[PDB]
Ligand binder design. Sequence first.
Ligand SMILES: [Ca+2]
Ligand SMILES: [Ca+2]
Ligand SMILES: [Ca+2]
Ligand SMILES: [Ca+2]
Ligand SMILES: [Ca+2]
Ligand SMILES: [Ca+2]
Ligand SMILES: [Ca+2]
Ligand SMILES: [Ca+2]
Ligand SMILES: [Ca+2]
Ligand SMILES: [Ca+2]
Lengths: 653, 653
Amino acid sequence: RERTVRLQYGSRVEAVYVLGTYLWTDVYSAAPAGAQTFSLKHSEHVWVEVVRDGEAEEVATNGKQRWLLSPSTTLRVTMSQASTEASSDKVTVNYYDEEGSIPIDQAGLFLTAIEISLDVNADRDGVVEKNNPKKASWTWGPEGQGAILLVNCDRETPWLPKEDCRDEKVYSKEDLKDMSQMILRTKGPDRLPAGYEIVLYISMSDSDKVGVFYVENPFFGQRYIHILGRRKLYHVVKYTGGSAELLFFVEGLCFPDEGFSGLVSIHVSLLEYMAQDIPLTPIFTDTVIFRIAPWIMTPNILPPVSVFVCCMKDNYLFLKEVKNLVEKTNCELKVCFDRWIQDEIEFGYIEAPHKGFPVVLDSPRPVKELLGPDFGYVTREPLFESVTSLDSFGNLEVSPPVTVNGKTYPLGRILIGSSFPLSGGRRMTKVVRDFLKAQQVQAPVELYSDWLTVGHVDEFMSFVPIPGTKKFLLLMASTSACYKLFREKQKDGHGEAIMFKGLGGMSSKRITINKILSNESLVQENLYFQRCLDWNRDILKKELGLTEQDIIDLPALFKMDEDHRARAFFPNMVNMIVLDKDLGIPKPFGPQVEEECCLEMHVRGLLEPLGLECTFIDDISAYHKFLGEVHCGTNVRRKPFTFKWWHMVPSRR
Amino acid sequence: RERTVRLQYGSRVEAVYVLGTYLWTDVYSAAPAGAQTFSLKHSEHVWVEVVRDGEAEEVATNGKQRWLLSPSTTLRVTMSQASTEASSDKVTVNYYDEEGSIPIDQAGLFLTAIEISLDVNADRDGVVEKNNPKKASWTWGPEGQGAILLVNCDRETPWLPKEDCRDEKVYSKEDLKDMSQMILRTKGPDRLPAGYEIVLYISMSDSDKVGVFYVENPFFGQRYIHILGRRKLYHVVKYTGGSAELLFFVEGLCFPDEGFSGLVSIHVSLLEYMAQDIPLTPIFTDTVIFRIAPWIMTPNILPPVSVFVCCMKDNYLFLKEVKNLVEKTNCELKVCFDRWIQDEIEFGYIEAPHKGFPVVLDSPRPVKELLGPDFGYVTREPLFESVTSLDSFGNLEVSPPVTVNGKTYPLGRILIGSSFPLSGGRRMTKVVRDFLKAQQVQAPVELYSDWLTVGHVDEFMSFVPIPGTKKFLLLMASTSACYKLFREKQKDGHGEAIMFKGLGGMSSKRITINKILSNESLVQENLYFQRCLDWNRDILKKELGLTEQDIIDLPALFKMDEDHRARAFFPNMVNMIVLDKDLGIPKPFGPQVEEECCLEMHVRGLLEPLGLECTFIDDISAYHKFLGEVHCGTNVRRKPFTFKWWHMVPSRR
Ligand SMILES: [Ca+2]
Ligand SMILES: [Ca+2]
Ligand SMILES: [Ca+2]
Ligand SMILES: [Ca+2]
Ligand SMILES: [Ca+2]
Ligand SMILES: [Ca+2]
Ligand SMILES: [Ca+2]
Ligand SMILES: [Ca+2]
Ligand SMILES: [Ca+2]
Ligand SMILES: [Ca+2]
């Protein structure tokens, strides 16, 4: 960076020189009228070139050399080391007229060199390198560069209800571990010359996206000063001489969203005092950029950590069977004593090179009771648009990593259910959709859920890993598979086999395979629902790059309501608890053949050959009947992907 | 694209097949209970594969071959040509049980194949190619692809005041020439099968960004039907059999802006009727994308077309000298009988492969009187923020094409004046700044103008081409050059030479070189203004990739007001009319030495050796005095860049 500093006619110029720049210096304007030639002297640590019409020539500390005065003959002035108290750094120019070799005038430039660098960890290793030349840019990918910031959305101490970033204060040094480091490094003499100050600042726009703290250690203990952030746009830095560092800690306050890309900037400037009533002149400015880390969902293929379960205290079979299942694994079971754990919350995570933690997304209106140390919270509330069943998080899921026609999605793709574009049907609120899209690294896909009364993708589809491989299966509800199976059992002499055996509230109904197969309107409804499933099958195959070999169909059956929307006839087996090879599967209560449920045996026959272990879990017996509704919920918290989100290269927006 | 179509148990399935897709067909669900094997027949133009667990085998039209019935044994069905009236396209499956070789049941699939393609000119040659595989994407650069749309902002007929895009109507066939073509191409039999329709549609969001028209030729003359746009989100297409094309014309309604990237989409779907009260199922969907062309500024290096001039009818010297200047060139002179032509308007342009026209940007509040055929209009009005002098377009300029540290800016970079970040000073309104940034291809740079009372970049800087080369110069106002010159003339014995000779309203002042040089406070003010100029010099060198060899300094002088802001002491020569080698330069009225203005002679000495021809133009004599204000204005309308904006690759936003 070249900077203009002119000698001044009949006076001496004093200037601060910032290392990493160089000066071009006009000596002509300061020459007396009628002066012919000039010479120069300079000190040891100042390098001086005389530049004539672009041609540069190095000059000694004291020579006698003279050059013709011309507007096109100038100096280039460079310094490679900061000034100390022992320094006198200067360039002096002598002027001469045509008569005589004694100078008729002198103009000079007295310099104080300092180093100023605002440094961050741009190379993403967790340590703050000195002046990364890429620190002012942010690039995606394995070779990409630039610093990363976490939204500090967890809560360090329980005393306050709100997340850490909702205020301007830091109470606890544990909070600093969530924050990115930024160091202002300087080198120079005991003080800045008269008329200069160093100032850190941010734009008004970024002031609700960040906060920046400095740690002081006064007499009675450590304290945390908020120097940039909400309603503080600048901070005058206290300068210390010699080689010095000021350590700052930076927190993000906001996730990327509609209208906010996630990028924020922080600046430091050296300012020069001109006079009262006149603005200070930025002499030098250094900038760093941060990208705020996106919220990321976890697919069923990722290792389970904790199984969260909600049910009534007296549903004993459910609790017993869920505990049994989890005991086969290394997971924690967490129980709360009705679908809210599935519908109101989605467990995501955030990650930066220095730290990461799980973060809950809260569905639009006691889930804020999950907020705690290294467990974060985020929510979006529609300001205008009304919430529908499609805003519930049974309608929010995510695929395993996929490659679709050469395009890699290393974090998978978010899936949310919707209605056809021209249908006038339900759709998840724009505010939530906009939020998921803005995270960018999960590239969301809309499926068709609005044929279902509740309207959730988890009613019809799920993913499971294939044990001992890197692969996975798509599981789809299928009415055609159910009808095929029941027609086979009927042919085999089982048509009088009864559904829902043991649910006392259903006994008067006596539902049999025969009764199901002879219900003509139910057949037509389910043919239509199969068309709805197949439409989804096609979009999943297209957008996930799946073939028929990647899909397994589980028998399912639905009843139609007055809106021509589907609800489960028997419990939907596809929405299941997936812990690696072990699957909690809702107990279907299907027709008994030889004292085994034919739906259970059929499902085992599909899954077991692949090394999957099935446990059927009964949530409905405590209610004595099944009306299409589920009274329990589970949500599995999983380990984050090994792949770092910042190594992705998302498509241009 | 693979699509799911199942045979139906005990019934025949009729389906439309869209060319470019293929069907995967379940034959198992339709088999009677207890059936063992199946065989198949198919017609001539239907290709059928039996796929067993992923392994595909082609099958004859009539063979006797039988396969085991399995859920994993399916059909793949493909057609390569559209159905005609002579077609019977079908696949029939026979089922058999273990006893006997006579079929016990039959299921079949009757197909009608059609071609549906929504086509645009994605390869940007002006003609609409058939089904460009990249038509649904938009990519920048020489190898980039996707269709381009103009904002149709001009006005075809004078009868209505507003721009063409402000309504839903097309009056004149000339209007269609501004529009991009889109063709829906189809092939098929006399009619679509029962229950199907084809529909064009757009999102609610895009509905204020586009309009789409169809030309009908009824009995009494050509008419224009608006089929998509404001308050019309879909249009049911009238289907014609055989090979058919429907030609549509697409207009943009809005420039890229804050919150609108410029990309819009149009879809066509084949929809299937299910039953009353149930939404129609999209069977097939095809999409095209358009990018709306940005508004682009023209730098002084581009060929002049028309010189627009505003002044009073009696300023005779001005008109005479401007006419003289323009007569040296091929330009039109257009005169309107006070700075509004410079301050209220900026002449830009828009371009698409099929057409381009100039477009005026109107500064925030009779410039709408420029609206006409192939002369467009656009404006931005702050909803809240107050307008200041910095919103005037003397504060809006653009550089010649530059390369800055390996990064090419083939259209140049927009330059607008501002104040220092921490100053609390004036800044151009956000709405206009956001608009310029959103055009993206001119990558705007803010300079420091707020040290000037009026606050415009054109007060201190301009660009000129260097004749006979591809290069250009930056011209900067310089107070140091003026002081050097005056001090030389004083030494030469000219100190009593007077400014403003011949302006009768200034005669009582008797301003001399001596009087100027001995005014101590004026010297200090101008040293400070030179620091303001030099700060700008440094930013221009950095952001335009310029060296000292690219810059010429023109003598200038300012007076300071109560706000510590500068106004011209004598007319600012840097703001000049540039027509290639010929320069209209405001007459400075400087000190006369040997009956020539020493400022004029000095400027000629700088410019003339480069092949530039200087004409000094006097706008102030008609006013008898100079107070720092200019009473005339000029704006030059230029030819667009040869480089196509779509060949640029702007940085990721
Ligand atoms: Ca590092
Ligand atoms: Ca806090
Ligand atoms: Ca925290
Ligand atoms: Ca924490
Ligand atoms: Ca979910
Ligand atoms: Ca073309
Ligand atoms: Ca119109
Ligand atoms: Ca038009
Ligand atoms: Ca036109
Ligand atoms: Ca302008």
